[model samples]
Target: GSKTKAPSISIPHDFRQVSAIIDVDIVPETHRRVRLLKHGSDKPLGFYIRDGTSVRVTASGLEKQPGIFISRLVPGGLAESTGLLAVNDEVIEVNGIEVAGKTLDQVTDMMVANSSNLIITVKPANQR
Candidate 1:
């Protein structure tokens, strides 16, 4: 049987991928904007949320603006009970993955890829 060689696919070494097996089945997708600012200044505070909080992120103009930043939040702050987004401009990071030079769709897809518990890290936007 004639076989066609699949196109060579590659992912940057700097980028890291996580399994979503637990994230999808365990936590429910919230799709809310969450802010994780505890100690501040390069401190990744582990929140360990129960539900799947969905954050609309944007990485437009990567040359100028890199990393996925919170663009909008579900009105009335649904994740308020969980204390996710007190402050605005939070960066949505999945499983310590670097989001620089990535698209919003790509990040979102990773959010609901595998079926596992999702621990989304919401960090402050690296804005000047």
Candidate 2:
């Protein structure tokens, strides 16, 4: 009888790509509004508007709005102008409604459901 040999497997290596990584931290305060802070920033971004997490931003005139309120961060004036925040960062309020003890998605839903203006505070990472 002839013995069977195991097949050899080949793996690819030497794969490289350029990528950027950013981290953002969002914390919601009780009775206050949503706060955005970069991982390296000293101060947090504050919003002064009121509505909830889900707000409608209008370029010419406010209508049905575009996407979720949080989506505004990408094209929003504050985020674009500051250029300090990273993608995938989420907002978490310890004592806010819906976010009180809900999952991440639930918390995000709360923010979307309740849209409001934000006050952003930008500072040097070293200062923070």
Candidate 3:
């Protein structure tokens, strides 16, 4: 039997609240969890990231937000091999640690130090 296995991607939870207000149902489905394997040496994670913003435009004005985004995906790299990650996916956490409001350097440091298994939570990019 062949041993070339693909990466892991799992949705660990679902939120369905009774008698909830607006926005509760919609917010739960947008986020996802993706598990990745690290190469442990010189091998790359197969992706790059950059700081980006998520903005909402209302009739009155614009509301801006910022977070880390997957800027590129390297062919055949661990990240690309997972098949769950894509360019522009907003990384919300790394190894169960929240990355929101953290610097790019801080996040990368965490990834580097956690080398081996990565449990990443991301918000899939589908904004207009």
Report, for every candidate in turn, its global Cα lDDT versus the true structure: 0.43, 0.35, 0.68
Minimum summed lDDT over a 10-residue window in model 1 is located at 43-52
Task: Tell me the alpha-carbon RMSD of every candidate.
Answer: 16.4, 14.6, 14.9
Q: What is the lDDT of candidate 1?
A: 0.43
Q: Which lDDT tens digits does candidate 2 get at residues 45-110?
A: 332111233234568565552121233343454444444432222233422443323454654444
lDDT of 3 by residue, 1-128 (tens): 87777668786767665533243223333455555566645445566667878676878689877889887788885456555456767888888888899998998788767757676666756343
Q: Number of the top candidate by lDDT? A: 3
Better of 1 and 2 by lDDT: 1
| Candidate 1 structure quality by residue, lDDT tens digits, 9-123 | 7766662565322332233333443343323242323322222233444564223344455544444443334433433434456645645556667665555452143345555
Clashing pairs in 3: none
By TM-score rank, best first, the candidates go 3, 1, 2
- Once model 3 is optimally superposed onto the true structure by TM-score, how far is the C-alpha of residue 83 displaced, in angstroms? 4.5
62 Cα displacement, candidate 1 (Å): 13
User: Candidate 2: where are CA atoms >4 Å away?
Assistant: 1-73, 88-90, 94-101, 117-128
- Residue 91's lDDT within candidate 3 is 85
